[PDB]
Design a protein around this ligand. Structure first.
Ligand SMILES: [Ca+2]
Ligand SMILES: [Ca+2]
Ligand SMILES: [Ca+2]
Ligand SMILES: [Ca+2]
Ligand SMILES: [Ca+2]
Ligand SMILES: [Ca+2]
Ligand SMILES: [Ca+2]
Ligand SMILES: [Ca+2]
Length: 172
């Protein structure tokens, strides 16, 4: 199975901090397939579904014994410190074993990283957000190129994403 019309976007170099305060870099992800999304922690009124979907994705990949990493980038890094990241994650039955939630950057940095790497327009919350616009899941290959995007908000094609993770792993 060969991966379709790959997006081939180049993820910019980065070093951010995870929920345990540990450095995570693009370089550190070299040779690994991974999945990426964009989240914020501060929502009383309806929280977006992305982390819930990603949680069920994480479970499905664990069940097929698939080597993958998961990265969630914060889009409100001023509020989302490593402790807030932990407390958010606590609302979900997810494992940190192959998932990092990242912060340690300004709003400007992440906005520009997201536009260059993923062609995504991210923004701060207005204290709330159902979802404003799409939000997508991205598949990144072992050499740091974005290969595919998927809808993380509704009707996530879990089986397609799993099949693409397996194919992106090939020949290594
Ligand atoms: Ca790097
Ligand atoms: Ca940095
Ligand atoms: Ca940093
Ligand atoms: Ca190096
Ligand atoms: Ca669920
Ligand atoms: Ca791995
Ligand atoms: Ca905020
Ligand atoms: Ca669903």
């Amino acid at each position: 199975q060969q991966i379709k019309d790959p997006l081939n976007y180049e993820v910019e170099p980065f070093t951010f901090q995870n929920q345990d305060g540990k450095n995570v870099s693009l370089e550190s992800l070299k040779g690994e397939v991974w999945l990426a999304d964009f989240i914020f922690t501060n929502c009383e009124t309806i929280c977006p579904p992305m982390t819930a979907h990603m949680t069920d994705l994480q479970k499905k990949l664990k069940a097929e014994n698939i080597d993958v990493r998961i990265i969630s980038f914060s889009v409100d890094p001023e509020n989302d410190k490593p402790k807030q990241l932990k407390k958010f994650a606590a609302n979900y039955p997810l494992s940190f074993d192959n998932w990092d939630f990242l912060t340690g950057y300004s709003q400007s940095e992440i906005e520009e990283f997201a536009l260059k790497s993923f062609k995504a327009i991210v923004k701060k919350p207005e204290g709330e957000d159902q979802v404003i616009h799409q939000s997508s899941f991205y598949l990144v290959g072992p050499d740091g190129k974005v290969l595919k995007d998927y809808n993380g908000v509704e009707n996530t094609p879990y089986d397609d994403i799993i099949s693409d993770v397996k194919s992106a792993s090939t020949l290594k």
